[PDB]
Each structure stands twice: as C-alpha cells, then as structure tokens.
Design a protein around this ligand. Structure first.
Ligand SMILES: CC(=O)N[C@H]1[C@H](O[C@H]2[C@@H](O)[C@@H](CO)O[C@@H](O[C@H]3[C@H](O)[C@@H](O)[C@H](O)O[C@@H]3CO)[C@@H]2O)O[C@H](CO)[C@@H](O[C@@H]2O[C@H](CO)[C@H](O)[C@H](O)[C@H]2O)[C@@H]1O
Length: 162
C-alpha cells in the first residue's frame, strides 16, 4: 500500500508524485541541478547544533555552508544558488521531530517540498520558482513514492511519521 522503501537513487524522476525521504543520518538528503540555472540541496541538521561551518560534497562540487539548529527538533534546510560562481544560501526549511521530508517536481519542472517552523499550524507545501524539468534528482535516503492524488496522506506522514 505504501510504495517503498526504495534505496537511495539518482534519476530524472517523473513529475507530480511525491518522493518521501526517510534518512537515518544527517547531512545532504536531496539534491538537484540543471548545471545552468538552479542548484538545490537539503541538509538535515541534528537538534541542538551550534552554528558551524561544514564542508559538503554535492553535485560534483565541494562547498562550505553555515548550519545551525539550536532547537530541539530536526531541521531539513534547503540551500540554493542560481549561478555556478555564486555561494549557496539557505532558503526554506522544515523543523520536525521526524526524519521525513518530501519532494515533488511539477509539470513545469519546479521543485516543491514541505516548509515550516513546525509541522502543525506553520506547515505548508512550498514551491521554488526555478524550473529544472529534465534534471537528475538525487534522493540520498530510503524513500517512498506517493501519487499527487494522495498528497494529504503524504502530509500526514510529514506530521506524524510513517
Ligand atoms: C515562496 C517562498 O520561498 N517563501 C519564503 C519567503 O521567500 C521570499 C524571500 O526569500 C524574499 C527575500 O527578500 O524574496 C522573495 O522572492 C521575491 C524575489 O526576491 C523578488 O526579486 C521577486 O521580484 O519577487 C519574489 C516574490 O517571491 C521570496 O518569495 O521567505 C520567507 C522568509 O523571509 C519564508 O518564510 C519562512 O519560512 C520558514 C520555513 O521555510 C518558516 O515558516 C518561517 O517562519 C518563515 O518566516 C517563505 O517560506
């Protein structure tokens, strides 16, 4: 009934379905680039992490990013740049007690994932206006596949675990 788990995989993934990742380790859990206009990855930050600069290998480069999570939950933090020469900067994030985040690429190639300072009242599905329709997506965790028609089921997992 729940479709998965699938081992970590990199692929030009189909659109309009949700890829729900369930990492057991911190660090990069998701990445995508078209090598031209958009570079995105999500870094899982452990609770009670003092601000630190850490080195990350992602999308054939090695970059330094600042991470921080003084709070008591996990933080899935998105890092994005839109030029090769530009530094990655954190954008949206998900503060959550569960190691679950989900991604969708829509018909125009835009990435959606769950954003929120909490997984209750603040939770929302966000979309980045940066189309990468044919890009390889790296899911660096065991993951599940949920049809767009069952998005509320995905939302329930994001809030409450598998
Ligand atoms: C859609 C989105 O990503 N919303 C974010 C929100 O993003 C906005 C922010 O980055 C501003 C920075 O000045 O830029 C906005 O984009 C504009 C372009 O910069 C501009 O050139 C263009 O002409 O118009 C664009 C309109 O979008 C961008 O949308 O940033 C806020 C934080 O400031 C996010 O809210 C925070 O989200 C976290 C979870 O990720 C928590 O929920 C926080 O409580 C909340 O403040 C918002 O999700």
């Amino acid at each position: 009934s729940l479709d998965g788990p699938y081992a970590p995989d990199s692929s030009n993934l189909p659109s309009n379905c949700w890829y729900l990742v369930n990492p057991s380790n911190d660090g990069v859990v998701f990445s995508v680039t078209d090598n031209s206009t958009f570079w995105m990855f999500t870094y899982l930050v452990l609770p009670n992490t003092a601000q630190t600069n850490v080195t990350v290998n992602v999308m054939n480069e090695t970059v330094n990013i600042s991470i921080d999570n003084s709070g008591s939950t996990y933080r899935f933090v998105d890092y994005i740049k839109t030029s090769s020469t530009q530094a990655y900067g954190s954008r949206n994030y998900l503060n959550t007690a569960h190691r679950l985040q989900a991604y969708r690429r829509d018909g125009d190639g835009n990435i959606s994932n769950y954003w929120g300072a909490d997984t209750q009242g603040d939770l929302r599905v966000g979309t980045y206006s940066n189309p990468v329709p044919n890009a390889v997506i790296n899911l660096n965790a065991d993951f599940y596949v949920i049809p767009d028609s069952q998005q509320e089921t995905c939302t329930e997992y994001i809030r409450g675990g598998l």
